């Protein structure tokens, strides 16, 4: 049944709760972002009000064929009224269209639900600074001190410099980047920009990107694979077998592949610096795992929480095991004691 951490007390509201059938008493279903674990269950047959960002409403209409009369897009950083309750959507620094939701409850409580986020100091100067938050429903994906990673900027710098070097040394190399959901668009867009190519991709991916209000997008992407030297593939296909195959398909236009797999965290972060990353190589194929995250590091999450000073924390990730739940509760207590709230 619908877990308690997807319910907002004192409202008729749920967050990312589309796979439980009709949730008894729910009058409005909020969707924080278009990733499958969060939208799972939506279709053209959905007949309840959905509240989301503009970008997420574009993807609902065009990819899942949700009927227009049930999509209620709201502008960011704007006080809005929903079934009698004041709400504000804030940028989550996750994938395109991803939001946090502030609820101002009739009784005076103030709840922030982060959806999925990468905490950033820039958040400390949004509408959040204006009032106190009693309850924080928190994206705890990487809530453990081993999870360190570089800034997005340092990782993109690494990818650009790597790709440019390779193709300038061999003008017949192909660059390939893996994807399986929206998010991490900067990786492939930044590489294509330095090389003076568009990014080539399936029709279904092209459609998805055209929903995202990215400026100048028609200049950056294409479905003509033959005209492009940066190709996007399903993540699954980013291995020596799927890449050898792909190379065959290009008909001797190319004699080398350099591939990028932008993962979440991986254990080489505990030891290695971005400067020091190396590919796995087989023949004329090289694959780079690069730690491009769109979730908070442990330290970024800790700063955000110690700034906000919530009275209660409700984790929304890693909640399925007792050891995970108990370890996270121990970090929350350390943070509150170190900061004094
Ligand atoms: Ni997500």
From Swiss-Prot:
Free-text tissue specificity from the UniProt record: Expressed in brain, heart, kidney, liver, pancreas, placenta and skeletal muscle.
Location(s) in or outside the cell: Nucleus
Signal peptide: none
Inducers of expression: During mitosis. The mRNA encoding this protein contains an internal ribosome entry site (IRES) in its 5'-UTR. This 5'-UTR generally suppresses translation while specifically promoting expression during mitosis, when cap-dependent translation may be impaired.
Family: Belongs to the DNA repair metallo-beta-lactamase (DRMBL) family.
Subunit field text: Binds constitutively to TP53BP1. Binds CDC27, which is itself a component of the anaphase promoting complex (APC). Binds PIAS1.
Function: May be required for DNA interstrand cross-link repair. Also required for checkpoint mediated cell cycle arrest in early prophase in response to mitotic spindle poisons. Possesses beta-lactamase activity, catalyzing the hydrolysis of penicillin G and nitrocefin. Exhibits no activity towards other beta-lactam antibiotic classes including cephalosporins (cefotaxime) and carbapenems (imipenem).
Protein name listed in UniProt: DNA cross-link repair 1A protein
Organism from which the protein derives: Homo sapiens (Human)
GN (gene name): DCLRE1A
Residues of the full protein shown: 700 to 1040 of 1040
């Amino acid at each position: 049944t619908c877990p308690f951490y997807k319910k907002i007390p004192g409202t008729g509201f749920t967050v990312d709760a589309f796979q439980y059938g009709v949730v008894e008493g729910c009058t409005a279903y909020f969707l924080t972002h278009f990733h499958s674990d969060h939208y799972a269950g939506l279709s053209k047959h959905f007949t309840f009000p959905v509240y989301c960002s503009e970008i997420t409403g574009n993807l609902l209409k065009n990819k899942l064929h949700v009927q227009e009369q049930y999509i209620h897009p709201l502008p960011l950083d704007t006080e809005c009224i929903v079934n009698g309750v004041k709400v504000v959507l804030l940028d989550a620094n996750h994938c395109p269209g991803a939001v946090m939701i502030l609820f101002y409850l009739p009784n005076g409580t103030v709840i922030l639900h982060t959806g999925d986020f990468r905490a950033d100091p820039s958040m400390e100067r949004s509408l959040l600074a204006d009032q106190k938050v009693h309850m924080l429903y928190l994206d705890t994906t990487y809530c453990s001190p081993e999870y360190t990673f570089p800034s997005q900027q340092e990782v993109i710098r690494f990818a650009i410099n790597t790709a440019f070097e390779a193709v300038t040394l061999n003008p017949h190399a192909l660059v390939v980047c893996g994807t399986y959901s929206i998010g991490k668009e900067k990786v492939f867009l930044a590489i294509a920009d330095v090389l003076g190519s568009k990014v080539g991709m399936s029709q279904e991916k092209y459609k998805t990107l055209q929903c995202l209000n990215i400026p100048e997008i028609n200049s950056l992407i294409t479905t003509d694979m033959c005209s492009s030297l940066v190709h996007l593939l399903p993540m699954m296909q980013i291995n020596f077998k799927g890449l050898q195959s792909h190379l065959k398909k290009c008909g001797g236009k190319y004699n080398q592949i350099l591939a990028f797999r932008p993962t979440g965290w991986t254990h080489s972060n505990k030891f290695t610096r971005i400067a020091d990353v190396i590919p796995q190589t087989k023949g004329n194929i090289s694959i780079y795992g690069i730690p491009y995250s769109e979730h908070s590091s442990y330290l970024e999450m800790k700063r955000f929480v110690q700034w906000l000073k919530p009275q209660k924390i409700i984790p929304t990730v890693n909640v399925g095991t007792w050891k995970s739940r108990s370890t996270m509760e121990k970090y929350f207590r350390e943070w509150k004691l170190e900061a004094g709230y």
